[PDB]
């Protein structure tokens, strides 16, 4: 009952953590796409 | 009680899990950019 609600709140915190991890993974993919774009930029420049 | 005790641990570990997962995700993500740069360099 009450322990179930507390575990639900803890699982909500863990789900926020997982959503943050997924958003960070997507952001990392975008950042490394930008890094590949930059690498191509100075590579074509070189 | 059980309710007070249980919620604290997972909430505390959530931030560490998010940080570790973000760092790992960036770790393999940078590998793709490094591989593309290596192919371009070759």
């Amino acid at each position: 009952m009450v322990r179930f609600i507390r575990q639900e709140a803890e699982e909500k915190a863990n789900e926020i953590s997982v959503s943050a991890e997924e958003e960070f993974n997507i952001e990392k993919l975008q950042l490394v796409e930008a890094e590949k774009k930059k690498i191509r930029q100075e590579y074509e420049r070189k | 009680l059980a309710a007070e005790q249980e919620a604290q641990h997972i909430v505390a570990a959530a931030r560490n899990a998010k940080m570790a997962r973000l760092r790992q995700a960036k770790e393999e993500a940078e590998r793709e950019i490094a591989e593309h740069r290596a192919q371009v360099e070759r």
Binding site: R3, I5 | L1
Partner: peptide, 17 residues
């Protein structure tokens, strides 16, 4: 303070709170 032990027992029996 006197009923803290009874409250702890009641929380244990009945049961982010």
């Amino acid at each position: 303070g006197e009923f803290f032990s009874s409250a702890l027992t009641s929380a244990a029996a009945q049961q982010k709170l």
